[PDB]
Amino acid sequence: MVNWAAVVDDFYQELFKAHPEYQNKFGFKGVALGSLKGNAAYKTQAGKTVDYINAAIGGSADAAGLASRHKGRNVGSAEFHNAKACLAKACSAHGAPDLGFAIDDILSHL
Ligand code: HEM
């Protein structure tokens, strides 16, 4: 099966490398990027991200609800466009399909 967990790990490496300040909104704020896999807050967040991807592909994802939740953290369209780029890189590095369609669905509610 597609190793979405590995894709997600690379995604966060790309995301926080390009936009380190985004990491301050998370429970693993301040943690060195190279050590995130050993952080409990990160493990939970990564798991939820993997789940969301599998839900988008599976057809059960609630893109409107995820979009609203992000707005509730002052995360909007600009951040998701940046994320779209980081995720494309991560997908490509693992021979996984691009997930732009899934991010676009979230964007349609931002
Ligand atoms: C590919 C793009 C993204 C995906 C698939 C994604 C997915 C998710 C998911 C599934 C959750 C859990 C929501 C829940 O528990 O109901 C979450 C939470 C969150 N996301 Fe994202 N997200 C993305 C982009 C971003 C970006 C660019 C930021 C910028 C800061 C961000 C900030 C947050 C924050 C602060 C939380 C809450 C963390 C917490 O509860 O400790 N997200 N995201």
UniProtKB/Swiss-Prot annotation:
Entries under CDD domains matching the protein: Mb-like
Domain Globin residues, every copy: 2-110
Residues annotated to bind heme: H70
Keywords: Heme, Iron, Metal-binding, Oxygen transport, Transport
InterPro entries: Globin, Globin-like_sf, Globin/Proto, Mb-like_M
Gene Ontology MF: a single term: metal ion binding
Superkingdom of this protein's organism: Eukaryota
Subunit details: Homotetramer. Self-associates in the deoxy state. Seems to dissociate upon oxygenation.
Membership in a protein family: Belongs to the globin family.
Protein purpose: Acts as an oxygen store capable of sustaining neuronal activity in an anoxic environment for 5 to 30 minutes.
Protein name (database record): Neural hemoglobin
